[PDB]
Ligand binder design. Structure first.
Ligand code: HEM
Ligand code: HEM
Ligand code: HEM
Ligand code: HEM
Lengths: 141, 146, 146, 141
């Protein structure tokens, strides 16, 4: 349940992302809609095209939610209580979809941080995204 | 596995510049490190109790290259992935009994390895295309289980 | 989907005494109740905000029977499940975009429904056989995605 | 995260199982080895045949671990801390395998309790087995 080493790696890899967090969330979301067209089902109201300002705005949202969990890592359930409600309870987001997003987030970090994406930080960041996802699916979980 | 000419140009231009000695081994290592239950299949490889053990293991970088070898085959034969993999499927399915789910994992960590070694060249178009192939080879290895 | 003569005797003796009106609907309902994200596909069915709403819905017991209909088809044609399901696959894959994972779920709750309505008759032999068919139909519906 | 209604359903369905708990664990384990032959990998040392006294002894173990979680439902992480270690950390049990077991457990309960296996208790019992499984995979999770 996120070891001290994991928490340290995650703070630090997040660190490097810095002000690019929002940019990265947009890229991640775009990677998912293209590779996993089944997720597109949940955003009929969006224009999913490439420079879509809907997708950019949402990437920022996703990046801020994550920075919120990193900043509150020992207390994610409480930090992300509202988002859960939304995801698990009002949008009924298939759990499968969190895996796909978490994968595309990792591919995006790997694509931006060649120095920081070691085997260990990758293991850590995988454990963090999976935690995050366990919190957001927990209304029927 | 269909792949349009655009996807195909994408996957093939990419695969062409892949260091076939390293990438294979880096994916196996990250699989062993990130999904550590897969080590149950690779205890004969020696010391794996840290990532540095694993990322340095000669056995690991030697078995990864074989792995990529086979991916190169399938890239060659998308129109017939079962044909290409039939022998490989009996091995992993009927003899090793690997859960097909771990085929999907190895493909997705091969995709991370690709994004890592290629940076911004590994745009989301090219990822999309690559998720296809990887889904397809995972689908084929998994045949004997179907 | 291979199925030996023993497995086949098992699956067929069973399926023969299945109330084709109820079992279909009880599985859809338990799917909607147990895996409540699948309701996103069935809001046109009306009031589903309790299990009793769902288990009583006329639309539900009407769509379940169709579902079983199709399972009966595949039991008829194990040697060619793609053939049998091709039309169904375009629907759920290319048009509805259901994640194939939920095909596995519906099969496994159909298996629970079977164990529930048949008790100790649904020995583990007969479950084994039935997991085969269910894996196989899930595999076929999922084709267009492969 | 197991609602009051869930906890109540689970206590009660477990209740009915009573002294048959061990018997049911054996049946569940046998259902899994047959339907999901890939799990058999983890028990090379067992004789998996039908009346195997290895499998019977183990069913009791699995049933007692679960009765321990039901009895300590608001505190499973602590209750099952040791088992996790074993499963997540010393046996490296593929996570996939917990889903398969949890399914076969449900098929076994459905096969024994026609009155009690309503749609709701089934939803509850699904949520409980998934929790249980989240605790036992949490050393790399
Ligand atoms: C790592 C997990 C993810 C995080 C951090 C996350 C975060 C968020 C946040 C913070 C918002 C806006 C919050 C608000 O305005 O109240 C949002 C909206 C929403 N999320 Fe996510 N989400 C995640 C995963 C998913 C997944 C997997 C899907 C489905 C593919 C999804 C579908 C939605 C939908 C459809 C909405 C609202 C509808 C709209 O766009 O207006 N989310 N999410
Ligand atoms: C994308 C999927 C995969 C591919 C392309 C693949 C391909 C291969 C190839 C090339 C070999 C060499 C076979 C030979 O020498 O003839 C092999 C061996 C093996 N694979 Fe994989 N494999 C896959 C995934 C995995 C996974 C996920 C596991 C479990 C973690 C696994 C476990 C093994 C093991 C243990 C062997 C060795 C058997 C022995 O010692 O001879 N493989 N595989
Ligand atoms: C074992 C797998 C499944 C089978 C055998 C199956 C089969 C069918 C059949 C018989 C129909 C009727 C099509 C027609 O009238 O021509 C249908 C419709 C539909 N299925 Fe499935 N299905 C499967 C799983 C699911 C799953 C898991 C979902 C998502 C929860 C889903 C969503 C739908 C929906 C929403 C429709 C209706 C489309 C419309 O309104 O016309 N199905 N399916
Ligand atoms: C609902 C989850 C499950 C529970 C409650 C559970 C419980 C237990 C318990 C209490 C023991 C004996 C404890 C001891 O002596 O220290 C055991 C042993 C073990 N479990 Fe599980 N387990 C579960 C899932 C799994 C799964 C999914 C597998 C893999 C298919 C598995 C594989 C093993 C192995 C191989 C051992 C020890 C080796 C031996 O049999 O001597 N367990 N488990």
């Amino acid at each position: 349940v996120l070891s001290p080493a994991d928490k340290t790696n995650v703070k630090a890899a997040w660190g490097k992302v810095g002000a690019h967090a929002g940019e990265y969330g947009a890229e991640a979301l775009e990677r998912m809609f293209l590779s996993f067209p089944t997720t597109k089902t949940y955003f009929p109201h969006f224009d999913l095209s490439h420079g879509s300002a809907q997708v950019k705005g949402h990437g920022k949202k996703v990046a801020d939610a994550l920075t919120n969990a990193v900043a509150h890592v020992d207390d994610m359930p409480n930090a992300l209580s509202a988002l859960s409600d939304l995801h698990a309870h009002k949008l009924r987001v298939d759990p499968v979809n969190f895996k796909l997003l978490s994968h595309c987030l990792l591919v995006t970090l790997a694509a931006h941080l060649p120095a920081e994406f070691t085997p260990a930080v990758h293991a850590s960041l995988d454990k963090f995204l999976a935690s995050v996802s366990t919190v957001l699916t927990s209304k029927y979980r | 596995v269909h792949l349009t000419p655009e996807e195909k140009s994408a996957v093939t231009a990419l695969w062409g510049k892949v260091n076939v000695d390293e990438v294979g081994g880096e994916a196996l290592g990250r699989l062993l490190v990130v999904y550590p239950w897969t080590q149950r299949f690779f205890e004969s490889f020696g010391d794996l109790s840290t990532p540095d053990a694993v990322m340095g293991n000669p056995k690991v970088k030697a078995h990864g290259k074989k792995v990529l070898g086979a991916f190169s085959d399938g890239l060659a034969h998308l129109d017939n992935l079962k044909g290409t993999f039939a022998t490989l499927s009996e091995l992993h399915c009927d003899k090793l009994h690997v859960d097909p789910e771990n085929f999907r994992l190895l493909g997705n960590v091969l995709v991370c390895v690709l994004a890592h070694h290629f940076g911004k060249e590994f745009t989301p178009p090219v990822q999309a295309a690559y998720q296809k192939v990887v889904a397809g080879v995972a689908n084929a290895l998994a045949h004997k289980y179907h």
